[PDB]
Scaffold this active site. Sequence first.
Site: not given
Length: 323
Positions: A97, A130-132
Amino acid sequence: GTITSQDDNVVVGYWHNWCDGRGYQGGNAPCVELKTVNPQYNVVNISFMKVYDIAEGRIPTFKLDPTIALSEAEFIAQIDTLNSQGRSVLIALGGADAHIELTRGDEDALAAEIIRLTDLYGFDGLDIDLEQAAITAKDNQFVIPAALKMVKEHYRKTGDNFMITMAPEFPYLTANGAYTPYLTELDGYYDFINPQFYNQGGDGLWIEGVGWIAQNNDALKEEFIYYIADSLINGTRNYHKIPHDKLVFGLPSNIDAAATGYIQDPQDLYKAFDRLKAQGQPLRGVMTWSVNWDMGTDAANNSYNQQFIKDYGNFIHNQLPPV
Ligand SMILES: [Ca+2]
Ligand code: NA
């Protein structure tokens, strides 16, 4: 202070900029002061540089959580102490997020904010985590490498090695996989990659004579570690090549820290690492989510009692330095 870079093996641990995170098995992760972090974590990644509110613009930043009850000045001083112990403190870009969706042209402001934060807090570098959803959002694949090249050059000018690391989820490291633009654009700038070998359920690889080797299969954990690492350090079996001296094996601290991927029997890692060593390709270390979980409690409030750093600290630190 001094940008403090790492030349030898590493044990990387992430540090939560928040209090009392909930675990995957109902446990709890306290906020802890930097000075409390076990010293065998010689890289400590401040989590996370992100966009707190889109009303503040697209460029991520870092704001020390006041619930941690640590003044700016004191945080700074604790980073300085870590540096005096020969330990690096990186800022981790991303996390869940994070709202990082950069547009071409943003690289100049991103580079600026990285430098500002680095000079304010005395960070030694940055971890791309980084998130997906962020890996291929908007122009992130262009903007983040572009900015980091500029930051690396800025500090190279006064003889400093601003560290660059990355924490890709391993399934994105296939040949021509979604993380590969970060790796190719920053080849020669990144210090090491610490992929997350966890939270990917049954993802894995097939090996003749062994069968299907999943990341969530505890009976084949040695074979998982060995073969996934072997593929990466040689660019084989359809994986992008990361050299062994720049590969760090990322793990959950315990079963609360991640859904899957925790190593039940540490000897599976000792054995896998020693095989990689014996073929002339020793890895650079281990990484974990997270120092806070290693210092946390299970659902019944039992301390995890630093079990991760106890299992792997000496194993890794007592290895020969890399080539
Ligand atoms: Ca496994
Ligand atoms: Na520093």
